[PDB]
């Protein structure tokens, strides 16, 4: 009864169902994304790119371009170089 | 070792706890052994007689199965417990004429039908067709 | 042979030569449905030609569902005009048929086992994956789905002549494996 | 005296640890992605199958890379030249020299071997007195819980 | 700043009309009316999801459909509504759905 | 953003405005109108006037008002 | 039955806005007047660039302009269509049929396009 | 790629494992393995012999603990059914599963449709469909020298 033949693993189909139901992130208008990015800046000084993506919920490539337009990344010797929301 | 140590060792192992935050718990509790089995090219299992192990240079091992209980917590005050009965984890080499050998309790005529010497004392392992004895 | 494949689906692509606003089109278009989370295009459907077209913000559109070349272009023009009516400078540039799908029957059962053995270099028959036999025609680049019931589906053709030529080439081969 | 049981239990303890160390790694990777994991796929069966047979086949104990401290000669090919040789091989005892052997000479026949170890059967040569055999009615206890 | 679905209804229209009447009398500032509408939308949304436990069925012919901003705008023609207790007939209906 | 998000949009809007070709200076209040920052805090209004719009190397104070600095940039 | 739901909605609405009215500093007397007015109101083309070769390829565009017909507001959990027919799996929602107000929890619908 | 390679290696050696069997031992789904399977054949410019119903009888029957005579009877039934074209277009696994059920019900060791499906990875409905197609010719498919624990006339009808 071990390794019984299966078309697809139960975990794999459930994960696919969740991803299919959720769908891919959409490209929101720059103004809305910029407002969300600025608003979240109050909570904390600096954000990680991966974590910032979850907060904004936008494609990484699109988010990076928007972040590059205003935001910059500062090198930190303690953990790594991280993006800084402050344009200056 | 088969009847006590193998079971004691697995139960001695602490349950596996995994955190992502959903929590996954895995516990090994029960051990099962089958007769020394050999799998052909087609994958059909057949019992493995020691003489066949000697002649075909097969290791004389018994499949080892463990019951595993998996419980999942989704930080939503719900608990789901599922158990995987008889999970294959490996093959234990079997000492000939031990309680877990195919030649256990067989009468002398039964041994001869299997091309086994009734006077053979056992007490060794067939690893890749070589009768291997562990020196105390 | 006496059997002519019947075009079941026609896929054509046209360029409108103008960037489009998908959100505006969906809000104004009668039958358009837009879901960026699902797909990046706008899906519009029409009844009289019975075709579906995908409209992208780049201005390129793909038309599918047409059963004939004339219908596909007419449906594509209808979609282009609709977008033009919505305030965009849509045009009809470099309209092209990308894929044609045809179906037909040989009116007799076929032994796929023999066909794949004789044409192992073109035939891929895996009942585990798909009951039909996938024959990849070479001289015409046409993929044919041959079934035991005798139904044959031709796809990948850029022009109607390819469909007829491919079926003409395969018919004698199938006739040799009649069941 | 370390017989097959205690010797094999020592191996199985490590191999099971590696097996459980492996399922953690496999399961954690799937959990990090967030997708649930399949228990059967996590278990690597070769760990216990190959680990137990490799030691018996070669006679070395522990991991293969750790052969430096691995005891050698524990597992030997059964002697089948005569029935007596086969019987004696299955009742052989080994006294490793190691640090312990240097302090007190173990080749000499001790008084306490009476009835337990055959006083006559010992190899001639560099192994005199180190390789021993059980007396006929001598028995090695298998142990039990003191509870 | 909410879903804002039931505003374009008889219940929503009456509330909006009442707010305008008070505004014309200088009794309520426009900000208050917006807040009242937002609270009303929350209350009705919660009320429907909680106190509505009746099932119905309907059949019809689709004439037009749209999908933008996760909003369906199906336009059905010759729709027959079937319920365990009553049946209704309507020539044309517009269905606005959100999720 | 409070005390930090508003200024970013002012700079971005000002940069875009210059690209159009409007060299004419703009007042603090005028710029706030098109940037949807009319509700900006009072203490930020003086902070931007006194620090942000003078310390930055891309802001030129002309006749009291503020204009881009294309002269410093190579054009 | 329908009126009783409306009255319960009113009770929830007034309770929900009590905190807002206290917060904004407006007198509570406004709410009493609000309900009174609220109740009263209710009760060979070689050259292909031109697209003008075809005319009147669209139907009436004022269908959504009027919106005077019955309108249904609902929430959809699943809406799928298989090449001919649209199937609607809509959860709790409201309807306005011939002026009458209808409320449903679960509904199923199949349509042909 | 490895899962498809494992599937191809089994096919080349004359002991095919069904796509479901390879999937059960791999984190890769059957759909993905099949996609890789076709690509590898094109890349290697190789081919695999078409699988037959008897290529899985030994594994399936042994995994079901069915007697050898039942296995021979099932192989004869499956081979004859394909020869008679009683199941045109049906997957060889489904034919084998139905043949095993027909043979199993005719002997002392009887396995339910669910049991045969689990080992073979075929839904009982598919086994039911194939069984219904070969049931009419049950006496012909069975080997002549077969001992019927349950008479062919009394085989389950469904």
From Swiss-Prot, chain C:
GO terms for cellular component: chromatin; cytosol; euchromatin; female germ cell nucleus; female pronucleus; male germ cell nucleus; male pronucleus; nucleoplasm. Widely expressed, with levels highest in the testis and ovary. Keywords: Disease variant, DNA-binding, Host-virus interaction, Neurodegeneration, Nucleus, Repeat, Spinocerebellar ataxia, Transcription, Transcription regulation. Its main location: nucleus. One of its GO terms (biological process) is DNA-templated transcription initiation. DNA binds at residues 9, 45, 60, 99, 136. One of its GO terms (molecular function) is transcription cis-regulatory region binding. Binds DNA as monomer. Component of the TFIID basal transcription factor complex, composed of TATA-box-binding protein TBP, and a number of TBP-associated factors (TAFs), including TAF1, TAF2, TAF3, TAF4, TAF5, TAF6, TAF7, TAF8, TAF9, TAF10, TAF11, TAF12 and TAF13. Part of a TFIID-containing RNA polymerase II pre-initiation complex that is composed of TBP and at least GTF2A1, GTF2A2, GTF2E1, GTF2E2, GTF2F1, GTF2H2, GTF2H3, GTF2H4, GTF2H5, GTF2B, TCEA1, ERCC2, ERCC3, TAF1, TAF2, TAF3, TAF4, TAF5, TAF6, TAF7, TAF8, TAF9, TAF10, TAF11, TAF12 and TAF13. Belongs to the TBP family. This is TATA-box-binding protein. The lineage of its organism: Eukaryota, Metazoa, Chordata, Craniata, Vertebrata. The gene is TBP. The chain holds residues 159 to 337 of 339 of the full protein.
Swiss-Prot record, chain E:
Signal peptide: none annotated. One of its GO terms (molecular function) is TBP-class protein binding. Keywords: Host-virus interaction, Nucleus, Transcription, Transcription regulation. One of its GO terms (cellular component) is cytosol. Its main location: nucleus. InterPro entries: TFIIA_a-hlx (IPR009083), TFIIA_b-brl (IPR009088), TFIIA_gsu (IPR003194), TFIIA_gsu_C (IPR015871), TFIIA_gsu_N (IPR015872). It comes from the Eukaryota. GO terms for biological process: positive regulation of transcription by RNA polymerase II; positive regulation of transcription initiation by RNA polymerase II; RNA polymerase II preinitiation complex assembly; transcription by RNA polymerase II; transcription initiation at RNA polymerase II promoter. It is found in: Nucleus. SUPFAM superfamilies: Transcription factor IIA (TFIIA), alpha-helical domain, Transcription factor IIA (TFIIA), beta-barrel domain. Belongs to the TFIIA subunit 2 family. TFIIA is a component of the transcription machinery of RNA polymerase II and plays an important role in transcriptional activation. TFIIA in a complex with TBP mediates transcriptional activity. TFIIA is a heterodimer of the large unprocessed subunit 1 and a small subunit gamma. It was originally believed to be a heterotrimer of an alpha (p35), a beta (p19) and a gamma subunit (p12). Interacts with NCOA6 general coactivator. TFIIA forms a complex with TBP. Interacts with HSF1 (via transactivation domain). (Microbial infection) Interacts with SV40 Large T antigen.
UniProtKB/Swiss-Prot annotation, chain G:
The modification Phosphoserine is found at residues 53, 58. It is found in: Nucleus. DNA binds at residues 80-81. The alpha and beta subunits are postranslationally produced from the precursor form by TASP1. The cleavage promotes proteasomal degradation. SMART domains: TFIIA. Changing residue 58 to A: Strongly reduces phosphorylation. Eliminates phosphorylation. TFIIA is a component of the transcription machinery of RNA polymerase II and plays an important role in transcriptional activation. TFIIA in a complex with TBP mediates transcriptional activity. Belongs to the TFIIA subunit 1 family. TFIIA is a heterodimer of the large unprocessed subunit 1 and a small subunit gamma. It was originally believed to be a heterotrimer of an alpha (p35), a beta (p19) and a gamma subunit (p12). TFIIA forms a complex with TBP. This is Transcription initiation factor IIA subunit 1. It comes from Homo sapiens. The gene is GTF2A1.
Curated annotation (Swiss-Prot), chain H:
Its main location: nucleus. Changing residue 38 to L: Reduces interaction with VP16. Sequence repeats lie at residues 60-136. Keywords: Acetylation, Acyltransferase, Chromosome, DNA-binding, Host-virus interaction, Metal-binding, Nucleus, Phosphoprotein, Repeat, Transcription, Transcription regulation, Transferase, Zinc, Zinc-finger. Residues 31-35, 91-94, 125-128 are annotated as: Core promoter DNA-binding. Changing residue 89 to V: Inhibits interaction with TBP. The modification N6-acetyllysine is found at residue 80. GO terms for biological process: DNA-templated transcription initiation; meiotic sister chromatid cohesion; positive regulation of core promoter binding; protein acetylation; RNA polymerase II core complex assembly; RNA polymerase II preinitiation complex assembly; spindle assembly; transcription by RNA polymerase II. Changing residue 125 to A: Reduces DNA-binding. It is found in: Nucleus; Chromosome. One of its GO terms (molecular function) is TBP-class protein binding. Expressed in the inner cell mass forming the embryoblast. Not detected in cells from the outer thin layer trophoblast (at protein level). Acetylated. Autoacetylated; autoacetylation at Lys-80 stimulates transcription activation. Changing residue 31 to E: Inhibits interaction with SSU72. Reduces interaction with SSU72. Inhibits interaction with VP16. Inhibits RNA pol II transcription activation induced by VP16 but does not affect basal transcription. Residues 86-158 are annotated as: Necessary for TATA box-bound TBP complex formation. Its EC number is 2.3.1.48. GO terms for cellular component: cell division site; chromosome; germinal vesicle; kinetochore; nuclear body; nucleoplasm; nucleus; protein-DNA complex. DNA binds at residues 31, 38, 90, 114, 123, 126, 128, 132. The keyword Metal-binding applies. It comes from the Eukaryota.
